[PDB]
Design a protein around this motif. Structure first.
Motif, short mmCIF file in Angstrom:
data_model
loop_
_atom_site.label_atom_id
_atom_site.label_comp_id
_atom_site.label_asym_id
_atom_site.label_seq_id
_atom_site.Cartn_x
_atom_site.Cartn_y
_atom_site.Cartn_z
N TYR B 77 35.87 47.32 45.27
CA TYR B 77 36.16 47.74 43.91
C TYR B 77 37.57 47.43 43.54
CZ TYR B 77 32.07 50.70 44.62
OH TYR B 77 30.80 51.16 44.90
N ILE B 78 37.75 46.95 42.33
CA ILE B 78 39.05 46.68 41.77
C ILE B 78 39.18 47.72 40.65
CG2 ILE B 78 40.53 45.10 40.60
CD1 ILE B 78 39.97 44.35 43.38
N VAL B 79 40.19 48.59 40.72
CA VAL B 79 40.37 49.68 39.79
C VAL B 79 41.69 49.55 39.06
CG1 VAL B 79 40.40 52.25 39.68
CG2 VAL B 79 38.98 51.07 41.41
N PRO B 80 41.65 48.88 37.91
CA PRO B 80 42.90 48.71 37.14
C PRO B 80 43.27 50.03 36.53
CG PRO B 80 41.12 47.25 36.25
CD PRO B 80 40.51 48.11 37.34
N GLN B 92 36.85 36.58 36.20
CA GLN B 92 36.35 35.65 37.24
C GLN B 92 35.91 36.38 38.51
OE1 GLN B 92 39.16 32.32 38.40
NE2 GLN B 92 40.17 32.87 36.40
N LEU B 93 36.71 37.36 38.95
CA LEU B 93 36.37 38.07 40.15
C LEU B 93 35.06 38.81 40.00
CD1 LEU B 93 39.97 39.23 41.01
CD2 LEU B 93 38.61 37.56 42.27
N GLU B 94 34.86 39.37 38.82
CA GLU B 94 33.66 40.09 38.59
C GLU B 94 32.49 39.09 38.70
OE1 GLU B 94 33.02 43.41 35.50
OE2 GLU B 94 32.44 41.53 34.43
N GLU B 95 32.69 37.94 38.10
CA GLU B 95 31.69 36.89 38.12
C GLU B 95 31.35 36.52 39.56
OE1 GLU B 95 32.51 34.20 33.98
OE2 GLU B 95 33.44 33.83 35.95
N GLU B 96 32.36 36.58 40.42
CA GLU B 96 32.20 36.27 41.84
C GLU B 96 31.60 37.42 42.65
OE1 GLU B 96 36.17 33.29 42.14
OE2 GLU B 96 35.84 35.12 43.37
N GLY B 97 31.27 38.55 42.02
CA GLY B 97 30.67 39.65 42.77
C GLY B 97 31.47 40.92 42.98
N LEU B 98 32.73 40.95 42.63
CA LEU B 98 33.58 42.13 42.81
C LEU B 98 33.23 43.14 41.69
CD1 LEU B 98 36.39 40.85 44.40
CD2 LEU B 98 37.40 41.52 42.33
N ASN B 99 33.34 44.41 42.00
CA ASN B 99 33.07 45.44 41.05
C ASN B 99 34.41 45.83 40.42
OD1 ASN B 99 30.92 48.54 40.96
ND2 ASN B 99 32.52 47.81 39.58
N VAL B 100 34.59 45.42 39.16
CA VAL B 100 35.79 45.75 38.40
C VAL B 100 35.46 47.04 37.63
CG1 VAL B 100 37.41 45.03 36.56
CG2 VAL B 100 36.54 43.36 38.28
#
Ligand code: ADP
Ligand code: ADP
Ligand code: CL
Ligand code: CL
Ligand code: CL
Ligand code: CL
Ligand code: MG
Ligand code: MG
Ligand code: NA
Ligand code: NA
Lengths: 385, 388
Positions: B77-80, B92-100
């Motif tokens: 998870y990426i939690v801004p 892009q990261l989300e597109e690559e599968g990361l959970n933003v």
């Protein structure tokens, strides 16, 4: 009370001796005040180290090692979290000017069953189970004879056995022997009580205040569920508070103490006391405004408590699996949380047998209902290895 | 939902992008679940880094730098936690599968005042103040002329806000908005002033089990900082319903699971949308004392895909900031024994330094009325002797 900013030159530094799940919440409470936390234990990645500014792995039983770490970090407060520490060194360090929570003497006395029992039964004249001390098997056998069956034997320093008959004598002594006090033991008569409680008692600048009594169930050496408030008569409550205040003031120093008592009707019997937060008190993470951990920090920092608010029937239920793994995972967590229900997962790096890996917390309209909600939630967690 | 054990091979890893005091409580709530936390910011020893497993200091606005840290730490998870993040890289990261968290699009729309204002007022047809955007001083003047006086100007990508009462202020207002904007140059928004009775933050959680609302949190703002917040703020049944409808609509439009701070203006039974944080909001710090699950615990519960179930509110409560003005890299807090006590607590954030006016902590209190809670918290915050 003056607090610095953690990691800055004037920081206030707290060193935790023992970094288990209780220390983890004490660390969180220190962090919430910007206090710098140094977590020490005998193994790496212990729970409190996860939330500390830094950690150290040392043998806490080695006084010399303890001295070096203390000298290295120069803490304003040394907060012991487990019995297994070189208390003789804590006394020395205190003598040298260090602040030991609640006090070094309290730590010494509580870690030795004879120390605390003599204090309570003899010096303070409090009601306790009958008892005898023994340093030889022969003596141990006479003690059991004097106490009668059944009786419980415990190492004064650590191995406990509920002795039903003389057939177990040999094995009882032996186990006591394997479970720090040069093999001396205490032999206690069995108290028959309706229920047992932990009276979490905070000693602070504004005096002693009490949390509502926490009932708990023990099984095979571990508390399984705890709950609050445990129903008690007003007289019983008064009696428990009087015993708790006497013990805590006699031990001395500011902190949260877990006074273990047995209740039989309106009669209250003293058992023992932790000079720090107690596991059964984890229910306070959901049951009060101030958790037992926040209370301990408030008290030791020289701040007033004022009051403790209780949010109705509440309970804790342990997540205590039994397996061997260094990469534990927890599945089905969505069925262990919800309204009035939370879980804590401690971050313990490994398990090899039975070990408490987390706890479920719940509130409800009745104590029995809260207990069931917490138990059910804990049971939904699937612990994988 | 499956959670690993922090620091072990199957650990569940969360990366905080922005490590301020709000991120610190998110970190504590992840730690309480044994979730591994990597805290990132543009400066060292930021509050959340104090309670994180590991920390990094990089340029969060550099997409490449962000990708490198993500590649290094492999968070789930990426939690801004702030707006100054390379939002195109988040996409892009989300597109690559990361959970933003809550979703990358939510971050993109809210980081720019124009994105969220146009979404809300135009696409969603939610009521808002009148507004006009401007990217040059002459266009700014034309905008003011149409919006009228008084009006407020703000940079679209951040300080730099000014309450304009007359033409006399035009010149300075423009200057400040430019200096306060991203890259020190950029578009501004000019808004008509809503004369509201009070303003609130409706903490709205979007989760696997639906959208939940915390009781409305009232707040008072002054010179760019919230000063006190309280809960519950009394609202008519109609106003509450309208507020919940607006909040539901905005959160579902932004998408993804998490807690959102929906800022609204209330005029009797009428509610006007102002803006929304796609994460915990500062005014929501009152929930550190007022609820069983703070806004931080709710954000974590929601983003991890767990059901909220419900939220318990303990009665009237308030928060009051500790907002000193000094320049120091070694701040101390004295007289703390007079800032805590029955139904009264404080939080000190661990911020490394200050150079001007900056929130270093908060006081929290409960009482039988919000009026009394606010006074208790304000008094306590004022008792803290900040020196440096
Ligand atoms: N004398 C006693 N009579 C009845 N039960 C006892 C007695 N002493 C201990 N127990 C039971 O054993 C449990 C654990 O013993 P305790 O004296 O509290 O040591 P510890 O908590 O360090 O294991 C108690 O919580 C109680 O359930
Ligand atoms: N159009 C408006 N009318 C009246 N007050 C406003 C308006 N826009 C903002 N404000 C006031 O200024 C505060 C800050 O504006 P806001 O849009 O929330 O920006 P930020 O929270 O990013 O600083 C609001 O909480 C409110 O007190
Ligand atoms: Cl009391
Ligand atoms: Cl864990
Ligand atoms: Cl850089
Ligand atoms: Cl426009
Ligand atoms: Mg015990
Ligand atoms: Mg705002
Ligand atoms: Na850590
Ligand atoms: Na997402």
């Amino acid at each position: 009370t003056l607090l610095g900013t953690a990691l800055r030159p004037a920081a206030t530094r707290v060193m935790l001796l023992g970094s288990g799940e209780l220390g983890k919440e004490v660390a969180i409470e220190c962090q919430r005040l910007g206090v710098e936390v140094i977590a020490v234990d005998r193994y790496a990645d212990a729970p409190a180290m996860h939330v500390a500014h830094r950690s150290h792995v040392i043998n806490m039983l080695d006084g010399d090692a303890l001295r070096r770490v203390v000298e290295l970090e120069k803490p304003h407060y040394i907060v012991p979290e487990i019995e297994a520490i070189a208390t003789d060194m804590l006394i020395q360090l205190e003598e040298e000017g260090l602040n030991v929570v609640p006090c070094a003497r309290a730590t010494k006395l509580t870690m030795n069953r004879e120390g605390i029992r003599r204090l309570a039964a003899e010096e303070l004249q409090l009601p306790t189970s009958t008892y005898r001390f023994a340093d030889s098997e022969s003596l141990f056998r006479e003690a059991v004879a004097d106490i009668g069956y059944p009786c419980i034997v415990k190492p004064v320093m650590s191995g406990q056995t509920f002795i039903r008959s003389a057939e177990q004598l040999a094995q009882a002594w032996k186990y006591a022997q394997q479970g720090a006090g040069a093999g001396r033991v205490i032999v206690e008569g069995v108290v028959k009580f309706d229920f047992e409680i932990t009276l979490l008692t905070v000693s602070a600048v504004d005096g002693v205040h009490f949390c509502a009594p926490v009932g708990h169930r023990q099984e095979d050496g571990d508390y399984r569920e705890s709950w609050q408030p445990q129903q008690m008569s007003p007289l019983a409550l008064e009696r428990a508070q009087e015993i708790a205040r006497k013990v805590v003031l006699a031990l001395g120093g500011y902190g949260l103490f877990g006074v273990e008592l047995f209740v039989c009707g309106d009669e209250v019997i003293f058992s023992e006391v932790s000079p720090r937060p107690h596991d059964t008190g984890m229910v306070t993470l959901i049951s009060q405004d101030l958790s037992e951990f926040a209370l301990h920090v408030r008290a030791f920092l020289g701040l007033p408590v004022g009051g403790i608010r209780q949010y109705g029937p509440a309970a804790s239920a342990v997540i205590l699996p039994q397996l061997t793994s260094q990469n534990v995972t927890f599945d089905n967590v969505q069925n262990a949380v919800g309204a009035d229900l939370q879980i804590r997962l401690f971050g313990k790096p490994e398990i090899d047998g039975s070990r408490r890996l987390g706890v479920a917390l719940a509130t409800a309209e009745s104590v029995v209902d809260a207990i069931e909600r917490a138990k059910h939630a804990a049971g939904q967690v699937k612990v994988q290895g």
